[PDB]
């Protein structure tokens, strides 16, 4: 057997070529998302300056947007992606082409999945191409603390540089916090807040910064519904979220009051993994419509959960949920660990072990 | 009889002790250790790197380990050996053809020995590819000894590559 050439030649080898500015952007300054999509699926990379240009130009578009977006139906609402790029490709097949489909993402594009930078680069490129029909909200992972605690900062250092990471951090600050969809739905990543009673409370926030450890901006990104949501006993509205170690748990009477006070139909959010990719919570005793909806767009979460993902396609006064399964993706060892670092302690162990026994 | 010429860290009494251990392992008194004689020890039967070690010790390339190769082999695991020669022995485990570099096919095959059925061939090939890409600085599609140490030279595994003679 050959010692130089690759053994399993059937396995596609990631291209060393890095896309130039001329190859990605046309004469009109429009990004070629098809060229970008195909190259990224081969685990190909771009030049640093090109990647930096996609991030910054996208950031300039985002920072011209309001805290609370105004989006009308029809639109496809999406949940957590968590760096699962090859599942994101399937998402756009199921949810429809952005060339004629309006999109709303609820955040958490990075961390956990080992293709986070490809998710950002592609989504930002789509934002540049479709600035008025594709929309991105901020999730609790789009910040400096979690991306450093998990794998996204590491991913940037391995695949690109820390400069790209910094650019993303500044870009994440520009991400809108919420969206008002079809004058009926409030769309956030986490949920509600004791310091947010009206939609204008969201408009008064200063989002261009690191999310604080506590406050309204923290709660929108971090809060969860109660475990017994709809079947409360001791009630209250907001209680300390012991699962997250920060922010709050919100109850069914809490959200219902918010809906009635702001004349809204329901709340669309993500933040929590679902086996079915979605969950319909207790209907309101006024409309008979679900007061809360969780959307999760990461199938087979962490390659272990084996869950279905879903997107919410709201058109013709019909809220249809498109479930979908996971797709094949190139393998990575946990935390981008290389094989030398992985195997050497085993080498040193077994080889030493052999010699100890032949001398015993 | 003419004297034997070696190069090791061992004292006279240490070469003697290793000598009496060599004779004990030489079941047929052929003067050299064979793969079969190595595998005669139950603790080596479930070890996937025995053949790699033997091939490294076998400096003349005859398939068996004589007394000289035996001493010079074990010497790389002495307490009196530096960090470098212990990392170099590790390098040689991956470098099958002994050309001084680690290629894709080599890294795969040695990994395949150690992994077994814990990963798929396609999966293992991918992480072998990406490992070399990120560690290859001069860009010749292969891993030198310097590029190797640049990756693992802070794991302090030379500490746990020491045997008592």
């Amino acid at each position: 057997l050959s010692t130089t050439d690759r053994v399993v030649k059937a396995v596609p080898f990631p291209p060393s070529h890095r896309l130039t500015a001329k190859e990605v952007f046309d004469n009109d300054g429009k990004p070629r998302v098809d060229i970008l999509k195909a190259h990224l699926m081969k685990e190909g990379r771009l030049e640093e300056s090109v990647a930096l240009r996609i991030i910054t130009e996208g950031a300039s578009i985002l920072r011209q947007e309001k805290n609370l977006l105004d989006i009308d139906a029809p639109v496809t609402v999406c949940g957590d992606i968590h760096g699962q790029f090859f599942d994101l490709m399937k998402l756009f097949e199921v949810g429809g082409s952005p060339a004629n489909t309006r999109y709303l993402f609820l955040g958490d594009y990075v961390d956990r999945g080992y293709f986070s930078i490809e998710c950002v680069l592609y989504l930002w490129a789509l934002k540049i191409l479709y600035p008025k029909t594709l929309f991105l909200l901020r999730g609790n992972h789009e910040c400096r603390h979690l991306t450093e605690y998990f794998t996204f900062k590491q991913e940037c250092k391995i695949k690109y540089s820390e400069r790209v990471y910094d650019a993303c951090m500044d870009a994440f600050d520009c991400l809108p916090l919420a969206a008002l969809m079809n004058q009926q739905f409030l769309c956030v990543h986490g949920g509600l807040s004791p310091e947010i009673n009206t939609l204008d409370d969201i408009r008064k926030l200063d989002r261009f910064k690191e999310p604080p450890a506590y406050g309204p901006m923290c709660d929108i990104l971090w809060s969860d519904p109660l475990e017994d949501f709809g079947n409360e006993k001791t009630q209250e509205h907001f209680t300390h979220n012991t699962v997250r170690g920060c922010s709050y748990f919100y109850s069914y009477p809490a959200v219902c009051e918010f809906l009635q006070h702001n004349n809204l139909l329901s709340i669309l959010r993500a933040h929590e993994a679902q086996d079915a990719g979605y969950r319909m919570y207790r209907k309101s005793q006024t409309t008979g419509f679900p007061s809360l909806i969780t959307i999760f767009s990461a199938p087979n979460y962490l390659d272990v959960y084996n869950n279905k993902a879903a997107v919410l396609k709201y058109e013709n006064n019909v809220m249809n949920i498109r479930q979908f399964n996971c797709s094949p993706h190139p393998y990575w060892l946990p935390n981008f660990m290389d094989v030398f670092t992985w195997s050497l302690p085993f080498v040193g162990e077994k080889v030493t072990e052999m010699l100890v026994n032949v001398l015993n | 009889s003419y004297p034997l010429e070696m190069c090791s860290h061992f004292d006279a009494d240490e070469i003697k002790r290793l000598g009496k251990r060599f004779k004990k392992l030489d079941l047929d008194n052929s003067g050299s250790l064979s793969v079969e004689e190595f595998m005669s020890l139950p603790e080596l039967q479930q070890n996937p790197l025995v053949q790699r070690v033997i091939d490294i010790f076998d400096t003349d390339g005859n398939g068996e380990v004589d007394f000289k190769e035996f001493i010079e082999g074990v010497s790389q695991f002495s307490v009196k050996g530096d960090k470098e020669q212990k990392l170099r022995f590790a390098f040689r485990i991956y470098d099958m053809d002994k050309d001084g570099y680690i290629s894709n096919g080599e890294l795969f095959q040695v990994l395949k020995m150690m992994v077994g059925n814990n990963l798929k061939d396609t999966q293992l090939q991918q992480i072998v590819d990406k490992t070399i890409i990120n560690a290859d600085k001069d860009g010749d599609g292969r891993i030198s000894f310097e590029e190797f140490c640049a990756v693992v030279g802070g794991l302090d595994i030379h500490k746990k590559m020491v045997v008592d003679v």
Binding site: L333, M337, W342 | P48, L111, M114, G116, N118
Partner: peptide, 7 residues
């Protein structure tokens, strides 16, 4: 614990 395990 004979072969190298994925962490």
């Amino acid at each position: 614990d004979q072969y190298l395990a994925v962490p």
